Design a protein around this ligand. Sequence first.
Ligand SMILES: CCCCCCC/C=C/CCCCCCCC(=O)OC[C@@H](O)CO
Ligand SMILES: CCCCCCC/C=C/CCCCCCCC(=O)OC[C@@H](O)CO
Ligand SMILES: CCCCCCC/C=C/CCCCCCCC(=O)OC[C@@H](O)CO
Ligand SMILES: CCCCCCC/C=C/CCCCCCCC(=O)OC[C@@H](O)CO
Ligand SMILES: CCCCCCC/C=C/CCCCCCCC(=O)OC[C@@H](O)CO
Ligand SMILES: CCCCCCC/C=C\CCCCCCCC(=O)OC[C@@H](O)CO
Length: 505
Amino acid sequence: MAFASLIERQRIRLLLALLFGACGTLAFSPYDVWPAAIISLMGLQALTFNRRPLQSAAIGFCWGFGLFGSGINWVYVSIATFGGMPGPVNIFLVVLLAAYLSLYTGLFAGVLSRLWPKTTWLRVAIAAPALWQVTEFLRGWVLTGFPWLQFGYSQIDGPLKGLAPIMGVEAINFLLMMVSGLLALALVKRNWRPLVVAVVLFALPFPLRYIQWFTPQPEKTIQVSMVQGDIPQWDEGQLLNTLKIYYNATAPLMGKSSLIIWPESAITDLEINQQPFLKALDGELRDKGSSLVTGIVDARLNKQNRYDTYNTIITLGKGAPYSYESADRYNKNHLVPFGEFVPLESILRPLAPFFDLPMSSFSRGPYIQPPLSANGIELTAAICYEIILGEQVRDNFRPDTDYLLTISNDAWFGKSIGPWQHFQMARMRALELARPLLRSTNNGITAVIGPQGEIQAMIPQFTREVLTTNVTPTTGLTPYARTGNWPLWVLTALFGFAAVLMSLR
Ligand SMILES: CCCCCCC/C=C/CCCCCCCC(=O)OC[C@@H](O)CO
Ligand SMILES: CCCCCCC/C=C/CCCCCCCC(=O)OC[C@@H](O)CO
Ligand SMILES: CCCCCCC/C=C/CCCCCCCC(=O)OC[C@@H](O)CO
Ligand SMILES: CCCCCCC/C=C/CCCCCCCC(=O)OC[C@@H](O)CO
Ligand SMILES: CCCCCCC/C=C/CCCCCCCC(=O)OC[C@@H](O)CO
Ligand SMILES: CCCCCCC/C=C\CCCCCCCC(=O)OC[C@@H](O)CO
């Protein structure tokens, strides 16, 4: 009898949930098995059927734990290499992070069955997508958020990619949970009608993939070069060898590439301390008709005679004469949680011994900043983690933007799937805004993404290489570039409002 007790059957559901959760990791790069997203969501919606809320919440937690425990544990690579803590602590911190994010899938499951206990199409097709949209927003907002592993991104090369330029990637998250909900409903109820509807709703967006919301601008085509210095991890001697690598790789490209790009924090020294190098390089670039965009750390003295330390992008050369007082620059807005700041650190700071506090704290640039301009080219900039924040990138985008720009350094996570998941989401921005995206990294993944998310050029990871190719700007506004998120939030409110009112009836 034991195998069939009520608690054992609940536990079986918890194990299955863990498995279905882990299957969802296969949807994202480098695995790119986009059907695994539909499989993972079908289990989440099937295993929560006919459960009390706290049971369902536990199922949603274990589902998320399988998803995040298997799709985010690459953060271990950075913790174990630079954290200085024993192995067990490092494992525990990774488990901790996955348990934290699993709270939001648990919240989704608990709320879904509490308000929509019955196995309906309303539950799986109306309430679930609406509620999923809410709990996923909270995951990406609370404590500055971590909106990593959103199944919509797995459709970058899939049947539903045509929806992203219209309503953004969250619209794909929305439809996937609806389509997966109906498939789950068809199987447990062994009924063909929800299957047909799921197939229609899933296939209707297919032709949209062929819409080109943009027009190429051939007369503005240029040769761009992206230097992948592949620099490992307080030594001037090594900074000089870093400028040597970048200068020597860049010098033969001046006069040939109109735009040259070094990655995040390529110049591993304060801008204040490199005026002679930067002015000399400015002159050489200007005298050959080339421009350089580069990452750097800028400790800027402020009104209060203190230093705001920014993660910065500077410009030099033709159409961007370098100057410490230039406004042709970009300061990272969204810092990496636990990388560039610790959440809640401002509140709990007065109690910390001064000697234990970090030497410097990173400051944040404004949420909206103008495009960078180099050699007459408009570049909407995002640094590293910022490229995953679709709404933010779209609010900095302007109709005159020629290319999206992202520079980053993903060496912290070595050979793991992290950099690939990051690269995957970056491509969704190019598709959302119908602009080519230039992605310059330290040791990968360095690539040019076309206006429909396609990989147009790329150099392999872990190589000291220059990616040189011709790139063409685009003009035109996708429906999502014009609107942003609010169309889907209306649809989410319509769905949410209609579902909860019927649950009250
Ligand atoms: C068929 C039955 C098999 C039983 C369970 C199957 C489901 C698996 C998902 C479970 C995910 C667990 C999360 C723990 C964190 C991993 C970690 O410690 O980090 C590793 C990192 O060091 C490597 O980079
Ligand atoms: C600032 C932080 C706020 C974060 C927002 C989320 C709020 C949480 C409440 C609701 C959802 C989480 C509770 C259910 C999961 C825990 C559980 O039942 O575990 C069972 C499992 O362990 C069996 O093994
Ligand atoms: C330029 C503008 C282009 C605009 C294109 C965007 C398209 C987005 C809309 C897609 C969402 C439709 C969802 C309908 C739900 C039907 C349902 O719940 O069925 C239940 C039944 O199956 C139970 O048996
Ligand atoms: C009861 C409350 C429990 C709440 C959950 C606890 C969360 C634990 C996770 C902390 C460990 C993750 C460290 C990631 C390092 C990022 C990095 O490498 O930085 C890159 C940066 O340098 C690029 O600029
Ligand atoms: C003791 C304080 C307790 C505070 C409560 C826990 C808060 C949890 C929320 C968010 C934590 C997850 C962030 C992981 C960062 C890895 C990443 O994304 O880096 C990739 C690349 O972009 C870097 O270059
Ligand atoms: C009731 C019907 C039968 C139920 C069977 C369940 C079927 C679905 C799930 C598939 C199980 C595989 C989960 C792990 C996938 C590998 C992965 O995620 O690799 C991440 C790795 O890289 C860690 O970093």
